[model samples]
Target chain A: EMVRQARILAQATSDLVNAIKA
Target chain B: MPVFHTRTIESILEPVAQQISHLVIMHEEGEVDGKAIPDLTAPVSAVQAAVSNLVRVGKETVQTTEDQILKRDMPPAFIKVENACTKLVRAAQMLQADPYSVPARDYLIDGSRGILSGTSDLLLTFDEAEVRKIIRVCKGILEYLTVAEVVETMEDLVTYTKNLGPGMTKMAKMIDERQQELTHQEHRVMLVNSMNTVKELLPVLISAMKIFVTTKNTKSQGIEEALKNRNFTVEKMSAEINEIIRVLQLTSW
Candidate 1:
């Protein structure tokens, strides 16, 4: 599912942003 | 801090956006015959699991950060996503039971909107967070520039350059990355121009600092003028960044 895969990628990106902020 | 290659969150969301658009078109146009409607349970469950993972990570970020706005706003957004997923699951189950159900089709359409809105909200919030990171770097540069104004010795000048070199490099890298991410030509150009101004002014500022330190002139008009010019340029850049942040904040789609 493209949606599932995209959502996972988005989550990973968000986590990366958060990691940078931290 | 860990180094991560920054990307626009919207790029990651593009596939999901397209899928949701396709889902809406199929349902609204009656592309599927009643008997031909496929069971969506597996796909919906997979999406739900992914959303749940997103929420889990989001909550962790919220908990760790002291950002009052995020802590206040993010929980409800997560709830919205969970509710949307639940709605989608129910609609999928109903469609499986009664393929001809118009209400189930309507529910699916509404659920898709909910998912889109919720996901966009989360991504946009994270985008703002990324922008804040850039802003922090801009502020660091400004602080160093301010300190540069007071350099009394060659040692101080070298120290200032040493401290500022990495920050300027970081700032330039961020602006370049962000410009690439932006879709609007104007926004990209604005970033490029602002970054270029800062880059151009930095050498002049360093040269002025060197002259002031060599002459041991605390009241050197040249260094004072250079510092003022540099500070103004950096402040303008920060304002440009804030304007971009405002645009990012207002954009919901």
Candidate 2:
């Protein structure tokens, strides 16, 4: 459960950064 | 129909000379509508030489002097003398074509009208109020707005104003020394129309920029480079336009 939640959190952070850069 | 004290001939030239005098005034004082213009006085009265008679070589002498002015790149006198020559040639042609015909006067009238139109167009470029307002708006935006926002908002304004520079330059250059004598009639008409369009667009574009600036927000460190560019561009444009005005005024003489 903890691993799954951490993976989802990292993916969301990466997407947010990409959106801001654009 | 001829000289009474040479004042009659000079009177026709008096108004034109006075118009040139305004440019001389601006050059001397850097502004107009000020206190009384300074007066001129004789430098040396000790050695006063009198001549019994002076030789007459009127047309040849005038043409020679004109050539000298052109060679020396004297913009002010060059423009004035060229226009004067145009008027002279035009008036002569009219009289030659029909000495006493009613249509003869129309040519002279049209020549004077052309001079007046060129003079007015030159004067319009010296409009202090328009320049001051532009500077004021730019400064106001700088003060009330953020850097990134200024750059973003003014992109269109920059392009619009930048585009006007070339048109203004081309129009002014056409009238610079020869008063468009060498330019084609159709070309002059097109340039004049383009200038009128630029004049109309200026205020509207400036107002739109003002509205965009009012929407400024605190977006820090995003586009400070653009902010700097915008600031310098506005200042440079202002100076360039003012320089153009001075050039136009000096060339008008």
User: Where does the lowest 10-residue lDDT sum fall in candidate 1 chain B?
Assistant: B1-10
Choose the strongest candidate by DockQ. 1
**What are the per-residue Cα lDDT tens digits for candidate 2 across B108-151?**
33333333333232222222223343444333333332332333
CAPRI-style grade of the A/B interface in model 1? incorrect
Q: Candidate 2: how large is its RMSD?
A: 29.5
Q: Where does candidate 1 clash, by residue pair?
A: none
- Chain A TM-score for candidate 2 is 0.65
For residue B218, model 1's alpha carbon misses the true position, in angstroms, by: 12
- DockQ for the candidates, in order: 0.09, 0.00
Chain B structural similarity as TM-score, candidate 1? 0.78
Model 2 stretches with alpha carbons more than 4 Å out: A1-22, B1-85, B92-98, B101-103, B128-137, B140-144, B147-253
True contacts kept of each: 0.13, 0.00
Give the per-residue lDDT digits (tens) of candidate 1, residues B58-164.
78878888777767766777887788777777877886888667776676667666766776677666666677777777767766665665777899889988888
